Amino acid sequence: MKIDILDKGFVELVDVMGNDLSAVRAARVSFDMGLKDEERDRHLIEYLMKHGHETPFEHIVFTFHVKAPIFVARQWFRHRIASYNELSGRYSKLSYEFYIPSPERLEGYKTTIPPERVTEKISEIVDKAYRTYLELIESGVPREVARIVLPLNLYTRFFWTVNARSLMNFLNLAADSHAQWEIQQYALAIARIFKEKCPWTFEAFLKYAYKGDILKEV
Amino acid sequence: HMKIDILDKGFVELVDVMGNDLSAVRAARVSFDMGLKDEERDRHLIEYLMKHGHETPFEHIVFTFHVKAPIFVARQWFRHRIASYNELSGRYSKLSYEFYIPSPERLEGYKTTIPPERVTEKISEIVDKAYRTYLELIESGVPREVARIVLPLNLYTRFFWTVNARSLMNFLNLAADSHAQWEIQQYALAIARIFKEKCPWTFEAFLKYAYKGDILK
Amino acid sequence: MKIDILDKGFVELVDVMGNDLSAVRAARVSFDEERDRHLIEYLMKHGHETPFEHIVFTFHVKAPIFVARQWFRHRIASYNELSGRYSKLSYEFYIPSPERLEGYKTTIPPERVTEKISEIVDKAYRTYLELIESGVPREVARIVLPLNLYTRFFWTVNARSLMNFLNLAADSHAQWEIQQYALAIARIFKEKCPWTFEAFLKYAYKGDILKEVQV
Amino acid sequence: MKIDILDKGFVELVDVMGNDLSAVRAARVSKDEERDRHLIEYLMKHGHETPFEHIVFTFHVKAPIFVARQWFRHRIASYNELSGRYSKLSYEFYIPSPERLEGYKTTIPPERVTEKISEIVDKAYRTYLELIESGVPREVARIVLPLNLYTRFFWTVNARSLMNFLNLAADSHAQWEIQQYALAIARIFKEKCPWTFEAFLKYAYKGDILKEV
Ligand SMILES: Cc1cc2nc3c(=O)[nH]c(=O)nc-3n(C[C@H](O)[C@H](O)[C@H](O)COP(=O)(O)OP(=O)(O)OC[C@H]3O[C@@H](n4cnc5c(N)ncnc54)[C@H](O)[C@@H]3O)c2cc1C
Ligand SMILES: Cc1cc2nc3c(=O)[nH]c(=O)nc-3n(C[C@H](O)[C@H](O)[C@H](O)COP(=O)(O)OP(=O)(O)OC[C@H]3O[C@@H](n4cnc5c(N)ncnc54)[C@H](O)[C@@H]3O)c2cc1C
Ligand SMILES: Cc1cc2nc3c(=O)[nH]c(=O)nc-3n(C[C@H](O)[C@H](O)[C@H](O)COP(=O)(O)OP(=O)(O)OC[C@H]3O[C@@H](n4cnc5c(N)ncnc54)[C@H](O)[C@@H]3O)c2cc1C
Ligand SMILES: Cc1cc2nc3c(=O)[nH]c(=O)nc-3n(C[C@H](O)[C@H](O)[C@H](O)COP(=O)(O)OP(=O)(O)OC[C@H]3O[C@@H](n4cnc5c(N)ncnc54)[C@H](O)[C@@H]3O)c2cc1C
Ligand SMILES: O=c1ccn([C@H]2C[C@H](O)[C@@H](COP(=O)(O)O)O2)c(=O)[nH]1
Ligand SMILES: O=c1ccn([C@H]2C[C@H](O)[C@@H](COP(=O)(O)O)O2)c(=O)[nH]1
Ligand SMILES: O=c1ccn([C@H]2C[C@H](O)[C@@H](COP(=O)(O)O)O2)c(=O)[nH]1
Ligand SMILES: O=c1ccn([C@H]2C[C@H](O)[C@@H](COP(=O)(O)O)O2)c(=O)[nH]1
Incomplete structure (x- = not known):
């Protein structure tokens, strides 16, 4: 799963742990319960999302591989509740790859x-x-x-490991017209992958918790 | 679902895992604009990272455990803030007759x-x-x-624990150690066994170069 | 500042770094009452919360273990607590009225x-x-020993995480016992950061009881 | 306290909460100089680091973006920075001597x-x-604009995370430019928390440059 972004960027899914039922399982332990059936479990996801019970979604985890310009990465890397490893300009000769706006x-x-x-x-x-x-x-x-x-539009590459709760915070802030257009484009791709792997969580998120503006349009 | 029984009624069960030793190799190699190589060089890199304290690459390996433990043990465990938890509630559930009685x-x-x-x-x-x-x-x-x-502190509770390999190593340093209470040492031994099984190179390198405790030997 | 809670509990303020202007300074990245207070409201109403991380509190809290277990779930904070391994524990338990x-x-x-x-x-x-x-x-x-045994701890927390704590604990869905502790935390917060507290209540606070009970 | 760094940089202390005794107080859950200083050493030597989280600093730093990118990887801290979206940026760049x-x-x-x-x-x-x-x-x-453009930020960090920063940045493996910043951070830390700093150097510090200064 790989989505091209800007002129030379991309967001690629590297790995994932869990799915919608991982969150159902984690929530149900409060009540000394486990999984039930599709309708009740999907309903629970909506319930959790609607009432701000967010911790269960921490048990779903993603690893992405991202190629983006440094000015975008600087904004992205402000998300501290996540794991990063990035290409080094100390240790590597950097390639001729820069974001040139259309x-x-x-x-x-x-x-x-x-x-x-x-x-x-x-x-x-x-x-x-x-x-x-x-x-x-x-x-x-x-x-x-x-x-x-080298200028701020130089492309860099990094691995990003992030759980679904923090990922939703990222979508709130970056999949939003107040964020810079360039990182909006990355956030749209992150959303697409999220939706694919966790359709019930994504749908409930949009319906009840998402605070941004652009995902409800696109 | 690897499962290890602990104390009289406790357990540690592996629920899920993301990644393996190579997940760490991959994440570290990006600094040099590189990816995977071969077994010898990649295993060597894991040792190198462990021996020089380059720990961030191990954050890309993640575990979910399901744990049944007494409250006094859970209180010590839940002090590990770099992790995720959901636990059985005494507000919302009628609690079962299950207590840790020492032998x-x-x-x-x-x-x-x-x-x-x-x-x-x-x-x-x-x-x-x-x-x-x-x-x-x-x-x-x-x-x-x-x-x-x-209800007393030896009441059994249950929780899900999601934790990456870096934080899990910190947990082993502190809990798989004779200064920790014997009861949580037992849980830490089981966590170590599962870790070793899923990440043999990382575990071996950890024991050789980084592990600070005394019981895993 | 010390507020008694339950039958034998308390919340005591031990130290604080900064005040409302610490957040203003951080949002501006520098170094009128009207413009600065207006900025605090602006930040609160638009969800720009990071500037409030530069205000920090240390509390000293005496609370039953069941309350502490709920409180200690707030991971974005620092804790040190009395030990039952290393100390002989006192005969002090929360008996409900x-x-x-x-x-x-x-x-x-x-x-x-x-x-x-x-x-x-x-x-x-x-x-x-x-x-x-x-x-x-x-x-x-x-x-x-039962879960109502009193324990004591130090709690160091910044204003952003403290506001999250008030959202979740100063709220009727939280157990009544911790609501009582949250009210005291709010009172101290309001005293030390009146503009941030007022703006928080108006624009960002999600709970129900801080609007029902003064201070 | 303000220390100039590189050609146009600085590290300035804005605020501090607590001192060495804040850590002693927290470890005890509560002044006797010898025993309290001894406790600080004991904690440092045995890796009991949580009591040092109750000491907190706020710095104001001016640094090039390539340095800030390295610094901002320290997630256990608070940051607010100048914006190139919202501000016209000044003609200030790090030119190496x-x-x-x-x-x-x-x-x-x-x-x-x-x-x-x-x-x-x-x-x-x-x-x-x-x-x-x-x-x-x-x-x-x-x-x-190039990576050597100067930016400015506020940094709020507790003594435990600050010691991790010193381990990694006050060290010859770190880029020389950030080493220079870390030395200034160390100087301010030592000034405000002399016992913690001394015990840190003696028992816990993993870097190589702070024992030479
Ligand atoms: C439109 C826009 C404009 C921006 N402008 C600027 C700017 O001019 N300058 C600037 O410096 N930054 C700016 N930012 C970045 C912003 O201040 C945040 O750093 C960034 O959005 C990450 O948000 P976060 O802290 O919620 O995420 P994370 O760092 O991933 O934290 C996730 C959540 O964990 C909690 N958290 C984590 N660490 C702490 C902590 N130490 N204390 C308290 N709570 C914590 C919070 O609840 C937080 O929401 C801007 C962001 C946006 C979207
Ligand atoms: C033998 C023993 C005795 C103990 N006795 C007591 C006691 O009497 N009282 C008591 O209260 N606790 C006690 N503890 C708990 C101990 O103080 C820690 O809370 C616990 O061991 C978790 O360690 P941690 O902070 O490294 O883990 P985590 O909280 O998971 O943190 C992981 C790492 O992240 C960093 N980190 C996370 N959050 C922060 C932050 N806010 N600031 C700075 N760095 C951060 C640190 O580098 C830390 O090593 C004891 C532990 C042991 C092993
Ligand atoms: C009414 C009520 C009932 C509850 N019932 C239960 C229950 O039955 N079982 C149970 O286990 N818990 C229960 N809880 C606890 C709840 O799930 C949270 O653990 C607690 O309220 C602390 O909230 P927090 O995670 O936002 O705080 P902190 O842990 O302080 O985190 C602060 C913020 O930082 C971010 N953050 C920090 N760490 C991470 C991370 N690892 N991943 C993503 N984001 C992070 C989040 O944005 C979070 O909002 C209950 C709480 C309430 C109020
Ligand atoms: C010489 C040198 C070269 C480097 N090269 C590179 C490079 O090429 N590429 C690159 O991307 N980075 C590089 N780094 C950055 C490095 O990987 C760390 O990001 C940085 O040193 C900050 O370390 P930290 O994670 O310990 O600090 P913090 O992020 O502040 O964390 C403090 C402590 O909290 C704990 N912690 C916090 N968050 C988590 C979490 N999510 N999971 C587990 N534990 C956590 C750990 O115990 C940690 O030690 C380099 C650093 C140095 C010093
Ligand atoms: O939309 C924004 C604006 C700013 N910042 C953070 C990133 C940098 O650390 C700093 C400066 O960002 P610029 O505004 O220059 O991109 O503030 C963001 O994360 N997102
Ligand atoms: O209102 C609640 C209920 C539960 N929990 C957390 C704390 C414990 O880790 C676990 C069980 O707490 P009780 O429901 O038994 O209090 O879930 C809370 O933080 N607040
Ligand atoms: O070995 C220990 C001793 C204490 N604590 C923490 C857990 C509690 O928050 C508090 C006291 O626990 P006990 O010492 O009572 O087990 O300090 C631990 O994490 N491990
Ligand atoms: O010594 C280093 C080398 C790299 N990095 C981090 C910062 C960036 O996110 C990325 C690459 O930085 P440079 O190596 O290009 O400075 O890795 C550091 O923090 N310190």
Whole structure:
């Protein structure tokens, strides 16, 4: 399961633990009970979601593999209730891969410069920066220093392990028009995968708990 | 569902697991823009990570356990905040007649003025009386959340525990150790057995390089 | 600041870092009453909660074990508690007042329920002392003690996590006993962070009882 | 307390809750100097770290983004940072001194490396301002800015997590730039919590640079 994002980004599902019934099981222990049947168990998921009983959803866990620009990753990595491992500019020579916005990204803004020219100006500056980076590397400057000239639109890659409760918090905050458009796009892909693996939890989340605006439209 | 019986009526049961040793290798390798290699180099990397304290890659391995334990043991266990819990409620459920009664051998090493068998019996008596009072209060219309306050700390409870391998290693350091109470040591031994089974390379490296306790040897 | 709770409990404020302006400063990233108080309301009403993490409290709490077990489920906080392994425990137990059963039709008078709870704690405690006196280690002897035994702990918590605690514990769905503790925590919070507390009540608080009971 | 770091950075102490005795109080659940200091050592030596969570600091830090990205990986803490979405960003970038590289054999003089870094930041910043001036929203315009751009943040952290930070950042394996920040954090920690700091160095600190300063 892999969804392409932006010009060179992606969100890929690496692994998952549990499913909707993992949450049902965890909730039912309060009452000294276990699973029942489809109708009552699905009903329980809705009940939990509607009354803010969120801890049972911590027992569903995902691992994603994400390729995203650094400015997006910086926003994403603010979610502390999660696990991350990322590509290092200290330890790796970084690839020529940068997020160049499409002209349509500037739709809705009156600019004194054509959108195509904005695109071009972003490209020029990344090209120069990357060339400088390689030059510094070639001349013996350690990578950890050479990379400081690279722009925030450089692509990075990381593993993200997150449980369904924290993932819902992420969707609330990132699948939302107040978040930057670029991370909205990533959050939509996260939502798609979530919905696929946990359809009852996802549906109940949208119906009762989701606070953002865009998932109910798309 | 691996299941290990603990104490007189307790258990630790494995409910689910995500990932394995290679999940940690994969997560660590991304720093170098790399993925998996081969058995020798990958196993070597696990040892390397363990010996240098690079622990974040082990967070991508996750377990869900189902545990039945006495409340005094659960109170110690639930101090591990880097984990997820859901537990049986004395507010919402009528609690069962199940208590941890120590065996006489539990007092081995202690000189007691009362035979160990008699200590066992005294503990039994007091739980029996407390439980009887609990039922009586319930039967008379006292809400469960109040009636249960007379029940002793050796009452068995049950919970689900979801925990990643990093936090699980911290748990083993602290609970699989002679300074911890004997009862939780027993639970920690079972958690270690399951961990070793699911993550043999991580477990072996952990024991060699990082494990701080004294009983897992 | 110390507030008595239940028959022998209390919540005591031990220390605090910061005040309403600590949140303002963090939201602004810097260093009028009207503009700063307005910002606190703004943050609260839009769910910008991270700035309130820079206000921190340390409480000292004496509470029964069943209450502490509920309280200690709040993982975004710091705790240190008295030990039954390392200390001889005191004869102190929460005995409900008869009024605790008001609203419930019991086949036994409420005063008799009170008595029955007392008896059983007295017998359990006596058994505990007998076991200790006979050479049984404390960590085993204490397992016969009931859940209403008082314990004590230090609790260090920031204002964001504290607000989550008030949402869940200062609420009629929570057990009455912990509601009482939550009311005291609210009173201290309101005293130290009046603007944050007021804004919280108006815009973010999800519970029911802090709107029903003053302070 | 404010310590300058790198060419334009700093670490400033904003607030603190508690002191060494806050940890002693918590471990005891309650001043005798010798016994209380001895308890701090005892806790440190046996890995009883939770009592140090009751000491808390708030710092105000100015650092380059590549340093902040490393720092912000410490999840057991609180952060609020300047936004490139909401603010026009200032012309402030970390330009390494020539001495940062002297000790690496480079085919280009260190002074020329410095100059090449400066040129590229200057061009990037100019492009940024141009895009802003032409009506491109800030959140997009800023994506051309390099990783050595300075940012500012508040950091609230307890002594236990702060010790973990010192273990990992006040250490030669960490990038030199964040080592410099960690040294300043250590200085402020030592000043406010001398007993904890001394016991930490003696029994628990795993890094290599703080015993040399
Ligand atoms: C539109 C928008 C604008 C933003 N602007 C800025 C900005 O200008 N500057 C900036 O610095 N950040 C900004 N952020 C980031 C924001 O402040 C949060 O850091 C981020 O959204 C992650 O949210 P979180 O803390 O809920 O998630 P997590 O860090 O994953 O925490 C999840 C939940 O756990 C709890 N939690 C975890 N750790 C703690 C703790 N230490 N104390 C108390 N509770 C805790 C909270 O209940 C939290 O909701 C912005 C975010 C959005 C969506
Ligand atoms: C022999 C023994 C005796 C004990 N005696 C007592 C006692 O008398 N009283 C008592 O109250 N407790 C006692 N404890 C419990 C102990 O203080 C810890 O609460 C418990 O061992 C959990 O450890 P932890 O904090 O490492 O685990 P977790 O809470 O799971 O944390 C895992 C790791 O995350 C980090 N972490 C998590 N949250 C925070 C935070 N808020 N700040 C900083 N770092 C954080 C730490 O690095 C920690 O190691 C005892 C434990 C043992 C083993
Ligand atoms: C009326 C009532 C009845 C209850 N009944 C039961 C019951 O029957 N059984 C039972 O076990 N518990 C029960 N609880 C406890 C409840 O499930 C929570 O454990 C408790 O209320 C603490 O809430 P919290 O998780 O938000 O707090 P904290 O644990 O302090 O966490 C604070 C916030 O940080 C985030 N967070 C922290 N850690 C994680 C994580 N690992 N993953 C995702 N997010 C995280 C969440 O956003 C959370 O809201 C009950 C609580 C109430 C109020
Ligand atoms: C020299 C060096 C090189 C590095 N290289 C890389 C790299 O190439 N790629 C990369 O991604 N990162 C890298 N890091 C970052 C590193 O992996 C850690 O993210 C960072 O050091 C913070 O450590 P922490 O998790 O101990 O701190 P915190 O995140 O503040 O956690 C504090 C403690 O709390 C506990 N804890 C908190 N959250 C959890 C959780 N979810 N599960 C289990 N335990 C938890 C642990 O006990 C931990 O030690 C590097 C760090 C160093 C020092
Ligand atoms: O929408 C936002 C805005 C800010 N931040 C956090 C991320 C960075 O740590 C810091 C600055 O972000 P920018 O606004 O520059 O992207 O605040 C977010 O997480 N999301
Ligand atoms: O109102 C509640 C009910 C339960 N729990 C948690 C605490 C325990 O870990 C477990 C059982 O508590 P009781 O329902 O028995 O109090 O669930 C709470 O935090 N609050
Ligand atoms: O070995 C111990 C001793 C204490 N505690 C914690 C659990 C409780 O929160 C408190 C007291 O537990 P007892 O010492 O009573 O078991 O301190 C532990 O986690 N492990
Ligand atoms: O010494 C390091 C190396 C890496 N990282 C983390 C920070 C980023 O999330 C990611 C890559 O950072 P760089 O190696 O590119 O600085 O790993 C650190 O925290 N410290």
